[PDB]
């Protein structure tokens, strides 16, 4: 997409008929926002310009997949009983919430799915792709290990983390690997090789990390150059094959051996290049979790952060320290939206991600905020700043749905406003009465629903207006004494 002179996103109004042209020839352009999000209007008061340009709100989602997404996320919400509110039941609460997280996270995966299909990879795709990334990270930090370290669920954790790290960007892409296998030095004598091997070892892409070694020196060169060298490298490739992902004690024993290995190789004789001897220690030191090296060989910040947890100390306690050491090594990128939001997630300041998720998808953001209030990570004005910022985005969505013409998500929009744990019973009784005369009704069903709300809330007026409507049909229906 395209970002213009005033900041935000820039979208052409038409693909073939741009009305205004050259710089300097200005014309009074008038634009009205319609009752239906996808049906707006843009026209021009000026001779020879008599066409009406219908326009739809930039990046709007009419998707059957979307109104299928909103539906699902609503359920998870209404189902969280009174658990959606964290009182300002100690372990039972969490568990049920962390699951709804997976439920959410999932639904987004399914919707992200049907999207890749239907449209290929339009704007809307990548947005949700990042929205997810940010979400994986969030979960990894507060929706797995309720109160203890990587011991209480090493299996579940390391899976999430490793998922997040590689569910972010394609890299290392298969198209860049082959280049590193095409100058006085053989494949494995140039840093451009190891810097890759170590990156593969940091992201936990061990299956491939080994594949890269098997490409050159392993069985070859080493085996025929240095006895200790061919060994320390074989016992590592064999130690890598079995990196603990289920048992916490297994990790200890693992780091234990790795450390005994890098110790041995470290104080023994070497008949291979003095330079090749180093690349090997570094490899080993990194597998060993040498804070110093893990940094050196990381390309980004999230890399080093991961490695720290993977090969040094699996404790979200040093979460703060790991971040500082990483960001201080390689700054956060601005090219990719999800990065800052994560640094915020990890650093603790969660509220600061919400805004950004909104500019990607108001829906996801809205529900993210919600559950994040559940987990506990955060005046007639129902739409105020007084009520939980969570609640804010939630009604800010309910209101969106209304202008979406999806007579189906309407119930979703309404009951969303009713369940907003914040706001007076009356507060809503108003926002509803005002949002209702707009309900795009049709069938008798749509009408019974609309009455049942004149009941649950007592909008005696809207009630009458309805009786009016039937009065307009009955009449035209008296025009049959035939």
């Amino acid at each position: 997409k395209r970002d213009p002179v005033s900041g935000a996103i820039l979208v052409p109004m038409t693909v073939n008929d741009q009305p205004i042209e050259k710089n300097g020839d200005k014309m009074p352009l008038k634009f009205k926002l319609g009752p239906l999000s996808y049906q707006n209007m843009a026209f021009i008061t000026a001779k020879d310009k008599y066409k009406l340009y219908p326009v739809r709100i930039p990046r709007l989602d009419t998707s059957k997949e979307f109104s299928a997404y909103v539906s699902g996320l609503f359920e998870i919400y209404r189902d969280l009983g009174d658990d959606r509110v964290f009182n300002v039941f100690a372990k039972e609460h969490n568990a049920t919430v962390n699951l709804a997280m997976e439920a959410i996270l999932n639904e987004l995966e399914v919707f992200i799915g049907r999207v890749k299909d239907q449209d290929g990879r339009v704007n809307r795709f990548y947005e949700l792709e990042e929205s997810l990334t940010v979400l994986n990270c969030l979960r990894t930090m507060y929706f797995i290990l309720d109160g203890q370290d990587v011991e209480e669920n090493r299996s579940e954790f390391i899976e999430s983390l490793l998922n997040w790290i590689n569910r972010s960007d394609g890299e290392p892409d298969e198209e860049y690997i082959e280049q590193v296998f095409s100058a006085g030095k053989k494949v494995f004598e140039t840093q451009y090789f190891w810097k890759l091997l170590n990156q593969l070892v940091l992201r936990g892409l061990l299956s491939q990390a080994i594949g890269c070694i098997e490409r050159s020196d392993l069985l070859p060169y080493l085996s025929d150059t240095c006895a200790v060298s061919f060994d320390a490298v074989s016992d590592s490739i064999e130690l890598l094959k079995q990196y603990p992902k289920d048992s916490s004690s297994t990790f200890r024993e693992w780091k234990n051996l790795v450390l005994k290995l890098s110790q041995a190789f470290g104080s023994s004789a070497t008949d291979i290049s003095g330079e090749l001897r180093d690349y090997i220690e570094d490899f080993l030191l990194v597998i060993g979790g040498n804070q110093r090296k893990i940094l050196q060989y990381s390309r980004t910040w999230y890399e080093s952060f991961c490695g720290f947890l993977l090969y040094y100390i699996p404790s979200l306690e040093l979460s703060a320290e790991y971040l500082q050491m990483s960001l201080e090594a390689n700054v956060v990128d601005i090219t990719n939206d999800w990065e800052q939001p994560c640094v915020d997630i990890i650093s603790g300041k969660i509220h600061s991600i919400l805004p950004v998720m909104e500019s990607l998808d108001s829906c996801t953001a809205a529900f993210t905020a919600m559950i994040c209030e559940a987990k506990g990570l955060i005046l007639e004005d129902l739409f105020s700043y007084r009520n939980g910022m969570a609640s804010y985005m939630l009604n800010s969505f309910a209101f969106e749905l209304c202008s979406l013409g999806d007579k189906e998500l309407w119930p979703v929009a309404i009951g969303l406003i009713a369940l907003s744990a914040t706001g007076t019973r009356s507060a809503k009784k108003m926002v509803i009465a005002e949002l209702l005369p707009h309900y795009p009704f049709v069938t008798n069903d749509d009408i019974e629903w609309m009455l049942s709300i004149c009941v649950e809330w007592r909008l005696p007026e809207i009630a009458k207006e309805i009786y009016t409507t039937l009065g307009n049909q009955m009449l035209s229906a008296h025009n049959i004494i035939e």
């Binding site: 820039l10 009305p19 352009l29 926002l33 319609g34 843009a42 066409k51 910022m389 005002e434 949002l435």
Partner: protein, 300 residues
């Protein structure tokens, strides 16, 4: 989204969506009013009916709550306003699909803008002419949609030019109307005595005010009204009501580099649109701090 011929022989002025945003009512200098329908099946608009409405150039239009029927109102440079009740048992493209429910000859000068008051007050309407006189009409009795009486008749100021106005949508706040004449912008409220009064003004304009519209205060008590000025700046005011009105200037944006011609609101007062010389249309959303930030921009 593909355009379509308005079919107008002379420059078009106003385009208004009916309640359910299904139809749009055009009107230009070719003295013709055109209503278009949005086909459910195909996402295309097609002419419902065109018909000479006024003798001079037509400049404003606005529908009336479907709870009062299908009444389109129009104002023109012929110094008079006309109302039109749609005839359901007719043809389309004919010209006999809408009738002159009446005609308001009172304005002793060319009219510029006419908008129907909110439905909760009744079937009322305001209109501002060049004579700088506001006039409020209302068929006191909803049954006979042909006889409108003269409620109020306030005078704004001199005539040495652009006008427009917009009521206050909110059904739960005391009746009020915001009118803007040239470099001025004044808010009017109903009195204990049932007569109009000047409740406050929106300060800050340096040129004529092309467009002004009040926002649906859904969920809130503080009101909001936007301003499209000739100087090239959008202004959003926060009127809170405890004389009893407070007027705050929330945002201000020059992003357009030209003239803000049309400023419009969402149906829930969630989004704001601004169009001007720079042939672009920017949409604005509100912050948690309630400052306004542009979310997107369309062009040409």
């Amino acid at each position: 989204m593909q355009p379509f011929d308005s079919g107008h022989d002379d420059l078009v002025h106003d385009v208004v969506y009916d309640f359910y945003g299904r139809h749009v009512a055009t009107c230009s200098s070719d003295q013709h009013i055109k209503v278009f329908k949005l086909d459910k099946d195909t996402s295309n608009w097609e002419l419902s009916d065109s018909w000479r409405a006024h003798d001079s150039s037509i400049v404003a239009i606005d529908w009336a709550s479907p709870e009062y029927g299908r009444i389109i109102a129009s104002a023109s440079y012929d110094k008079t306003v006309k109302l039109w009740e749609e005839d359901p048992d007719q043809e389309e493209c004919s010209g006999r699909r809408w009738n002159k429910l009446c005609t308001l000859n009172d304005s002793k000068g060319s009219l510029y803008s006419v908008k129907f008051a909110p439905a909760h007050l009744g079937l009322k309407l305001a209109c501002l002419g060049n004579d700088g006189i506001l006039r409020l009409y209302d068929a006191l009795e909803p049954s006979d949609l042909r006889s409108w009486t003269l409620t109020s008749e306030m005078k704004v100021l001199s005539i040495p030019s652009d006008f427009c106005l917009s009521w206050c949508p909110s059904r739960f706040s005391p009746e009020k109307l915001a009118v803007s004449a040239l470099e001025q912008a004044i808010i009017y409220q109903r009195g204990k005595d049932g007569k109009l009064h000047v409740a406050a003004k929106l300060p800050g304009h340096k040129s004529l005010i092309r467009s002004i519209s009040w926002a649906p205060s859904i969920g809130r008590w503080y009101q909001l009204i936007a301003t499209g000025c000739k100087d090239g700046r959008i202004r959003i005011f926060k009127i809170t009501e405890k004389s009893n009105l407070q007027v705050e200037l929330l945002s201000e944006h020059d992003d357009h580099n030209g003239e803000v011609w049309s400023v419009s609101w969402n149906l829930t007062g969630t989004i704001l649109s601004s169009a001007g010389d720079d042939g672009k249309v920017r949409l604005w959303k509100a912050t948690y701090s309630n400052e306004f930030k542009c979310m997107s921009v369309i062009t040409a």
